[PDB]
């Protein structure tokens, strides 16, 4: 499920209250070079900082595992899905 | 088809139950939403 976007994964983590740090953006991932390690973002996002970020692949794998693990029951969700579809205009 | 239509009545009743629950808890739900939006605004400030 790495084919998705950053917004979907961030909102998934927020909704399910998962304890996984937000994924690093593709540009943020490529930022981390030898000279790229001297920038503010990389020097403040690597060690000793609670705001540390991690790659998109691992977060995608974690979300895929949690999504497949999370079982579903049609009676609980299908009416909720119909209500949300008929409510989006409001 | 009574068996096939059984799921239809179940789905319709569940949707109506959701609507009735919403119509019962309008006040508390929207108070919660207003408080959440206000705290979001004051945090973003």
């Amino acid at each position: 499920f790495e084919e998705y976007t950053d917004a979907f994964l961030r909102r998934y983590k927020d909704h399910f209250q998962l304890d996984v740090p937000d994924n690093l953006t593709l540009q943020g991932y490529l930022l981390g070079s030898k000279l790229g390690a001297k920038t503010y973002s990389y020097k403040r996002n690597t060690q000793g900082q609670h705001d540390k970020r991690i790659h998109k692949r691992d977060l995608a794998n974690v979300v895929r595992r949690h999504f497949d693990e999370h079982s579903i029951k049609e009676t609980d969700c299908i009416p909720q899905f119909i209500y949300k579809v008929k409510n989006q205009k409001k | 088809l009574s068996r096939k239509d059984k799921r239809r009545f179940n789905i319709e009743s569940k949707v109506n139950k959701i609507y009735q629950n919403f119509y019962s808890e309008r006040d508390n739900q929207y108070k919660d939403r207003l408080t959440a939006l206000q705290t979001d605004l004051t945090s973003l400030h």
């Binding site: 299908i78 119909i82 | 096939k4 799921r7 239809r8 789905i11 319709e12 949707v15």
Partner: peptide
């Protein structure tokens, strides 16, 4: 209410 009938027929057809 009638709109739910066709939606459920769609779901069972799926």
């Amino acid at each position: 209410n009638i709109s739910l009938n066709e939606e459920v027929t769609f779901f069972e057809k799926a």
